[PDB]
Design a protein around this ligand. Structure first.
Ligand SMILES: CC(=O)N[C@H]1CCN(c2ccc(C3=NO[C@H](CNS(=O)(=O)C(C)C)C3)cc2F)C1
Ligand SMILES: N[C@@H](CCC(=O)O)C(=O)O
Ligand SMILES: N[C@@H](CCC(=O)O)C(=O)O
Ligand SMILES: [Zn+2]
Ligand SMILES: [Zn+2]
Lengths: 258, 257
């Protein structure tokens, strides 16, 4: 059978090719997770179909309804066979889906418009003039929600209550807000994504200070799935045969415009 | 009572200065000692730290196919879990189970300060400064398998080196750097490298970026019921910030340079 892969439009992981309209199926897309999906599939020996997650989300459990949305929900409810995406490995997700060993490491980080007087999370926590926020429905938000670290607690106490909202629907909306806000909005996002944007025109953002945590992205499968074992072993193999480092270089450092 | 295999390797597991008045698990201290205690407390088991009898991480004998090291202890039923700086690798995951990683690392270069070496490419292009790795671990296997030009050239040199450039233990590698007057460089994991850089006599340095990217995981025998619980405890501990607080405790707070 053809394996249905859920993924998400998130640069440089999965992007539409400039000429996507002239192309069909898997050929419409390019990026790190596109290349990684093709390699996983070849090695494990299956055909596949890339499908972009319908609600545009990573995945969270609605606290009232109890339903999982996003990529996670496509797995949970049987709509997709695997997620190959910058999907963060978390405890609450690992309770309902399986993850491979991580294919890429990352931490939450700070994106500023260049010149903004902010060097750290501690600096953001101690002031009010520059607003800051996270993506509205993923692992970065949940991190703040849950932290007992005083600086991050203090940051959440401000973000959860700030008006108008400091949360954004997509990474791209966060980045555009940093860029348009004259130094007055800073964006909390994964280092991977921060570092990619920092090397793209108009070259007006930068990553500041250390990462706030350490984690990784994994390949996800529905709980129990037979595909999970093989996919895990393919991730390990591909790191060890150097493929993962090669794809990082291809999609980050070889694509630098700054 | 769970039998935990581990290995004496600083700052993961070390005998306390005063170990001889102490008994059982209290003889030991380090990142993996504290990690073990946290895992045990969260999954609610009693445990016994035991130091791996052959002092090795784990590799398979090419001829006999026997596994040695901490990996061997799990495979042959001698220990229930390995809590150690034990690298996740494909050949190990084929015979033992690993948690999601509790720490990231890569292979890195240790020099005696002042040595004119800045990169693996620099090591590969000269013969005056010898270099090698640990035996019987993942760093060696990385070079044995690499098809990247600079690393393949490095391996061709190391395997044929006389006298041997390989060492039995991390500590032997580090002592060979410190006494070789700049003429031996040691290839070792960045974790170990960076810890030692912060210890007296303050005469080593990590130079260059890491050559690869990997992680340490908690290991259990295949199919063990402990593997599931243990992996969930690792994730919890990371998210609660315990793993960061432990790395800060044992590297940078224990810093004397
Ligand atoms: C639970 C968790 O994620 N733990 C934290 C601490 C360490 N960890 C972590 C996250 C990501 C990585 C890596 N991502 O790609 C590199 C390859 N990973 S791997 O395990 O070697 C892979 C080939 C399966 C290493 C390595 C790591 F150690 C993140
Ligand atoms: N990788 C994240 C999305 C981005 C973020 O939350 O900053 C997730 O899986 O939830
Ligand atoms: N962490 C390594 C040992 C150290 C090394 O090879 O540099 C292993 O698990 O094999
Ligand atoms: Zn605890
Ligand atoms: Zn033999």
């Amino acid at each position: 059978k053809t394996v249905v892969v859920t993924t998400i439009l998130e640069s440089p992981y999965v992007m539409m090719k400039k000429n996507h309209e002239m192309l069909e199926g898997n050929e419409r897309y390019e990026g790190y997770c596109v290349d990684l999906a093709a390699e996983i599939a070849k090695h494990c020996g299956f055909k596949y179909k890339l499908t972009i997650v319908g609600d545009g989300k990573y995945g969270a459990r609605d606290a009232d309804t109890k339903i999982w949305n996003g990529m996670v929900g496509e797995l949970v409810y049987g709509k997709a066979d695997i997620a190959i995406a910058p999907l963060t490995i978390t405890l609450v997700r690992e309770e309902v889906i399986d993850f491979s060993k991580p294919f890429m490491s990352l931490g939450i980080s700070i994106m500023i418009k260049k010149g903004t007087p902010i060097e750290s999370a501690e600096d953001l926590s101690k002031q009010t003039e520059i607003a800051y926020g996270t993506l509205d429905s993923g692992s970065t938000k949940e991190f703040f929600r849950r932290s007992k670290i005083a600086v991050f607690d203090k940051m959440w106490t401000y973000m959860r209550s700030a008006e108008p909202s400091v949360f954004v629907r997509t990474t791209a909306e966060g980045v555009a807000r940093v860029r348009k806000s004259k130094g007055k909005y800073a964006y909390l996002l994964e280092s991977t994504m921060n570092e990619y944007i920092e090397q793209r025109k108009p070259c007006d953002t930068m990553k500041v200070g250390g990462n706030l945590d350490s984690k990784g992205y994994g390949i996800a499968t529905p709980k129990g799935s037979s595909l999970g074992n093989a996919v895990n072993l393919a991730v390990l193999k591909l790191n060890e045969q150097g493929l993962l480092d090669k794809l990082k270089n291809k999609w980050w450092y070889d694509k630098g415009e700054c």
